[PDB]
Design an enzyme around this catalytic site. Sequence first.
Site, PDB file in Angstrom:
ATOM      1  N   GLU E  57       0.828  -1.210   0.000  1.00 30.36           N
ATOM      2  CA  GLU E  57       0.000   0.000   0.000  1.00 30.36           C
ATOM      3  C   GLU E  57       0.865   1.264   0.000  1.00 30.36           C
ATOM      4  O   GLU E  57       0.725   2.155   0.842  1.00 30.36           O
ATOM      5  CB  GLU E  57      -0.983  -0.014   1.180  1.00 30.36           C
ATOM      6  CG  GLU E  57      -2.191  -0.906   0.971  1.00 30.36           C
ATOM      7  CD  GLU E  57      -3.255  -0.259   0.102  1.00 30.36           C
ATOM      8  OE1 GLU E  57      -2.943   0.733  -0.590  1.00 30.36           O
ATOM      9  OE2 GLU E  57      -4.408  -0.738   0.116  1.00 30.36           O
ATOM     10  N   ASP E  58       1.763   1.326  -0.983  1.00 30.81           N
ATOM     11  CA  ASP E  58       2.635   2.481  -1.189  1.00 30.81           C
ATOM     12  C   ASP E  58       3.493   2.756   0.046  1.00 30.81           C
ATOM     13  O   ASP E  58       3.585   3.886   0.528  1.00 30.81           O
ATOM     14  CB  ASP E  58       1.819   3.717  -1.571  1.00 30.81           C
ATOM     15  CG  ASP E  58       0.879   3.457  -2.731  1.00 30.81           C
ATOM     16  OD1 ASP E  58      -0.146   2.773  -2.523  1.00 30.81           O
ATOM     17  OD2 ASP E  58       1.167   3.932  -3.850  1.00 30.81           O
ATOM     18  N   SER E  59       4.101   1.695   0.571  1.00 33.19           N
ATOM     19  CA  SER E  59       5.077   1.768   1.649  1.00 33.19           C
ATOM     20  C   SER E  59       6.408   1.226   1.145  1.00 33.19           C
ATOM     21  O   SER E  59       6.499   0.649   0.059  1.00 33.19           O
ATOM     22  CB  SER E  59       4.600   0.996   2.885  1.00 33.19           C
ATOM     23  OG  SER E  59       5.626   0.900   3.856  1.00 33.19           O
TER      24      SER E  59
END
Lengths: 98, 65, 98, 144, 379, 255, 44, 98, 35, 115, 77, 48, 240
Positions: E57-59
């Site tokens: 999740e866009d980490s």
Amino acid sequence: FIGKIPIMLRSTYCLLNGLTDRDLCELNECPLDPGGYFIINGSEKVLIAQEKMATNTVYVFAKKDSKYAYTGECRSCLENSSRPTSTIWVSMLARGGQ
Amino acid sequence: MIIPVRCFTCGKIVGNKWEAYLGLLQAEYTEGDALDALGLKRYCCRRMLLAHVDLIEKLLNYAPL
Amino acid sequence: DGLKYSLATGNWGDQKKAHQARAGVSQVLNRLTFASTLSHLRRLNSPIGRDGKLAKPRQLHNTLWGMVCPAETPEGHAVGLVKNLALMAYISVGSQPS
Amino acid sequence: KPSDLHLQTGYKVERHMCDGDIVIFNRQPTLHKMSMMGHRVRILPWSTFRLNLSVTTPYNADFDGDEMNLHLPQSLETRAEIQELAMVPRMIVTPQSNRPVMGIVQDTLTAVRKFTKRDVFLERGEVMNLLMFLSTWDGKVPQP
Amino acid sequence: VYITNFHVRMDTLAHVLYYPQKPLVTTRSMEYLRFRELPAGINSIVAIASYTGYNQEDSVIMNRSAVDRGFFRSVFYRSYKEQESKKGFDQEEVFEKPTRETCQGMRHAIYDKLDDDGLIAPGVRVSGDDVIIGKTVTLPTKRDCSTFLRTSETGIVDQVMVTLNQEGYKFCKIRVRSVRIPQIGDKFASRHGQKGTCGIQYRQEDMPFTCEGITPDIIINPHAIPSRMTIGHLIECLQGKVSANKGEIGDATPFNDAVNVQKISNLLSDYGYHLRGNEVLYNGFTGRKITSQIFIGPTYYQRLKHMVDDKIHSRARGPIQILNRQPMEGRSRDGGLRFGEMERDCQIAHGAAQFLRERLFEASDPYQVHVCNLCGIMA
Amino acid sequence: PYANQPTVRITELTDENVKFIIENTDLAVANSIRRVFIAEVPIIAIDWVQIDANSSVLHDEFIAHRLGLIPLTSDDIVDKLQYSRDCTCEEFCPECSVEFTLDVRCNEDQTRHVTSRDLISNSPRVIPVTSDDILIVKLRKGQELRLRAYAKKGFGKEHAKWNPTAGVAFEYDPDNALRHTVYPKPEEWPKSEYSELDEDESQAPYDPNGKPERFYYNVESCGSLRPETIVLSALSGLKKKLSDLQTQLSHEIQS
Amino acid sequence: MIYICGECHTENEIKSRDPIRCRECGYRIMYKKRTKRLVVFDAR
Amino acid sequence: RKLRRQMDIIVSEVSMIRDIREREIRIYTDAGRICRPLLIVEKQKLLLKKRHIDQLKEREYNNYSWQDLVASGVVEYIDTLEEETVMLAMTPDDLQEK
Amino acid sequence: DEITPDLWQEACWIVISSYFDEKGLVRQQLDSFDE
Amino acid sequence: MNAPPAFESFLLFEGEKKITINKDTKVPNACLFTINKEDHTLGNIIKSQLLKDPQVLFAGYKVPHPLEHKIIIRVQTTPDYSPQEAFTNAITDLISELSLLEERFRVAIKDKQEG
Amino acid sequence: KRITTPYMTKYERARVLGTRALQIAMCAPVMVELEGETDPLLIAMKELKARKIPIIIRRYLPDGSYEDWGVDELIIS
Amino acid sequence: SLKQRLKGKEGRVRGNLMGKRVDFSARTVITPDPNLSIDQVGVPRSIA
Amino acid sequence: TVINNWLLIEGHTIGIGDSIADSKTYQDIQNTIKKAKQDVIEVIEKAHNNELEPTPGNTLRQTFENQVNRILNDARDKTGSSAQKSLSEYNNFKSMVVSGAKGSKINISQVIAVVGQQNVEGKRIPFGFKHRTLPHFIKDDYGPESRGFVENSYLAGLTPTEFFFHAMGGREGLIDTAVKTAETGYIQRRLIKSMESVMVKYDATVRNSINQVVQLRYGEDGLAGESVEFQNLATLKPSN
RNA sequence: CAUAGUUGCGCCCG
Ligand SMILES: [Mg+2]
Ligand SMILES: [Zn+2]
Ligand SMILES: [Zn+2]
Ligand SMILES: [Zn+2]
């Protein structure tokens, strides 16, 4: 004497104009600093260009918020005189009235 | 700023090579051949000398304290 | 003081009429990255005004080719209004027509 | 002064929040019941909030820059209210569309699509390592 | 490095990266921005691959060992300022370290770090509550009006300057240096809008690695790409790999047909690599070959100004307002959080009436009045 | 029910790296060995930088961080040195740390490169490894730097400055005979330098009976330790870890 | 306290009762001398 | 056009827009207009020649600057209003090829 | 005589480099203030 | 701010046991070894050695959280061979293997240095 | 004339558990057997399952009247 | 004015009674953690 | 937990090779685009010779642009379908789309084959200049390139005109998000305050704060939305 | 433990 005008950095009257990078290093000034801003009380202030409709030009639009079919307008103003820009409208009334 | 002591990824010492790398550039090597002359075979280490910007030389233009 | 006050506050017009003055003209220069500083210096603002309620300028018009960045706006409520000049973009300084 | 530290029944202690305490968790803008839900606290030794990935989808949350808000109920009555109404397992099914609100997410969803392919095969060591993470496992290794 | 003479300058806020790098994959235009001489970011071996699950999740997963090697380490500079003045003649504030009995009240913060002038000398550790400028306004004894730091800061006073102001008053500016190390939650971005947060930090051995012993510096989630379709990111990674192997800064001018992915792949294949940039990586925990191969290579990343220390805060019975009896943000973000109407009606939809009452009344501004039953007015 | 009889063959040995092969062993053993190589080999690295004076263009803890990453020749001294947190003294003694001193004064028009050569130890058996030379900082005319620091035992798990390896290349099954990895088009993939296939081949034929063995290693030392010494220290340290764990388990069972 | 002039780097003591000025340059920006308190940085 | 490209009386940035269909010649010399340089094309051929590039290769120790390029009538400034009356080749290597 | 198509790729960037060396990136503010 | 002390991922605390045993009630002859301040470096190798043992019906390990430094090793055996016995035997076998490997490695070092 | 459902609502469960837990936190007597229990919420849950909480819910019908139900009188949801 | 103190979305009503600041409330950035059950949230030690 | 710990053994990645197709696929795409642009030229010829007859309820310009739009849409769809059929079983874009966890088929067709027609307010790019979309086109040009049909994939890279028109489309998307956030919650905050007090009383009737009956039973059945679900009635559809 | 205006304009993040 009449007052004091803030001076844009690296402009023709700023002291940093024309100096070589050795001088700017001597004056503790970054030679890569682009300049183009003022210093007001130590705060670096930059002026944003403001977009506006051009002057002295005929624009025919369709005013939908009125009883006019079309409106020809012109924001008329002199070369650097009379800051009030007198705007004229020459407008054709709506033909739908009856 | 200044050259890192170690390559971030692997930890190979790349601090004793920046000045020599510039000296080889004065000898008119290609950048790749200069790095290969210094034995940087992994491209993690080659990234340092190839992409490093040496700003400390610029900061030594200003006066002290 | 007057000029200073305006360049301090970004309020433009009479100081006494600052209540109805245009604002947001002068800004603290953004010094966080060099590219950020250059973007702030080459920034243009289009106000809302009476023109804004007539035709929507938020869209990227075709005449924006090669004069202003096709993809650089502040995301949020200022999309399309705040823009940044193209690289080879020079603004006419004006001259006498005589 | 130990008399000032001495305690008796009926006194109250504002103890630091510890593991198991219930907390309401939300993200602005709040759009439905599942955007404000109860969780159990877990102390972790760094400076962020953590989430199981599935509960990101009801919150409409992603870890680009989002920050979320946490509130602590102060009364046992409020704590019980959050325990019986607001906990995320109680909020799995949303009555907006009588659907689950949260489901399997990006990496888990692709990985389980790969996993349940007909041509996946696991040797003894791999399955025995994997079954460690199955909490609700009776301890029977199934017939291969 | 926002400017070369940043050391002399004392701006309200500044950030400087320890080891900036000109990008390995550049554009011609970048020569004339002078970005080659003032870079912002580092080239980093990024591997695009799912892992334990902290990159999702866009980490972003970061190499703890690389950060230990100064990877993306930065300095955050504050510059406080205060000015002595004389208001009329009934008072004249003055810089000096106050004393407990000479002043009619002071905070518990220790004042035994300043000098006789009441200014801390540069090179001293400070906290989020220590005193930096000992200033006292005379009472028409005297009352202390000294200044402290932000509550969530712990740095070292870097440079203390003393000047005469425009009117002719001894005033001082004080730079405070705080070294920020990349940690979990710090925001990073590519040059393609792949904004991401540092999910977790793994030491080098836990990270995956190639046959050559190269670990990745950063591990993104592949699911960032399909919705976003930032293929310039992937082409940048491939071109940077070609550049680092070849020893030449690659050109990524957009509208240039001299470079297409085919030629880049052929050049990459000439250096003994998979022509599409993939590589077989080994699991850091078990050493097993990963069943699929991993696209990997150098890519220019850049740390953004946002950090968790800037944004983290919590409120519990702090400085309420002087009008509404409600929390307000003072010295920090410590004014609670607005329990907005959206949250109110959300709780109403939950039916959690008791918790809603607790939030709105019993834990915000509980008050009580006395009302006469006959009229009905507060008496 | 018993461990294998692992065999070693050293293919190459330099002062920079050691390349070798371990056979008749399990994958987990080899992976744990390279984990110990990266993380759990104790070396001596600079810690506790106390700066008497600094006039560099760089702030102080920048210099402390840079000195932390300087490798030090700690071949045999590290064995007899104890961890400082385990030692008993006024926090520093020759049985837990090694003192270093640096004092440079550039009053010269030329830029003065403060290198690893300028670092002075009190014990001559611990020196900077490069003593080309590692640049620490550059000083202008009228600029000085004076500091003292210590260097103490530690391993790469604590901080990467104690990591002695500059990259541990590791490989097994170079022909993909086990098919632990699945090339979608194996023709595209270049052969490894340990591969034994021909040119028409791209994978070895799949074996449904093979197991990971014949692990190829290349430990490249940073320079602090001889890589031979890195591997020997690694094996001894992992042996010590398992022996201590067995001692604790014996206590646990007896209790 | 001792202060260093921002132009000619002259070390000079200045009392906290008088306008600050370098004692042979006339310059009006001072810098406090570095503290003599011990300071330790872990190299981590 | 010849005078502006020679910079004899007309300074550059002065925009000359001919609306052929409306039979209008608008000349603009005011400030605020936005313009950019463009290479002049004639007979489907560039006025830029290899000698100019050679002189620009030694831009130092010969003092042939961009101002000489503008003065030699190879590159000229064009604004958005004038752009409507411009048939602008994208690049010379393909568009003006036979 | 005429720039070849292959050498054009160098030629355009030489021209742009000369342009930015002449002008710089803040000609707007400086020229406006000077006027 | 909330960064953990970096020196505490391998170093114990006061009254903290390096290893603890808990009988697992779900299955007979099955136990969990909770080992503190250890990473995969020991869990993976001990699991691999345990799997080679034929009497081990099941052997696995997990880290309950990567930011924490516990490992839980589940060992289940045939009902004639205690899990503690299997764990001790695995550690002794690994110690013997590492001693043998160190000896052979030193011999190979000497042979390569001379030759 | 009882018309409200015999099933205890989720809101009723929440409030009665919270109130009984608060009572037990004030050393209210416990009407269920407890072993090694310190958290009052668990004790309230156990007493709810045993249906021994000494509380009567008063449900206000919208007309203004009400019904009264013991916790044992209500079927637990 | 007195009437302006209430109107809008920031007055005593719609700004201080249909919502207000509340104590025992924190905010910070979120990060993923697959090793936590859905009903669990990790918190920093300082906030706790 | 289980699927992540297995994924460490498996591993998952997106790369350039997941974006490359075979040369035959690119050739098919080029043939499709050549044919489609030839068809658009033929339609423009029919419009210019005044032998295009308008569809009813549509003027001649509307009929012309509808023909061009449907031609380019079917060209994009055919190219995307052919690209999708080319995808290997290991192509990880196809993995992520088949799982449904991220992206979609249109994303694959855009990245691999053709970005497609860029639209503003649901229309092709208008003549911002005098009868021109840009200064690089002759006046009165209704071709796909001049009217903002990007015919290169993201992998192939866009030409400057294509890039500018795509930027215009992206700008429209950004403005749409802007006005969405503007109207985010205003409608909802109106609805919630109109319906804040409507609850279910203990007589199982739904009433407001005024105690006025709005529904005798909630949702006309007295059933919550948490347990209901879909079924099919088998005695509605079938014949007698 | 207790003590530090508004009221706006601008700007940063989702
Ligand atoms: Mg976000
Ligand atoms: Zn390296
Ligand atoms: Zn000691
Ligand atoms: Zn002086």
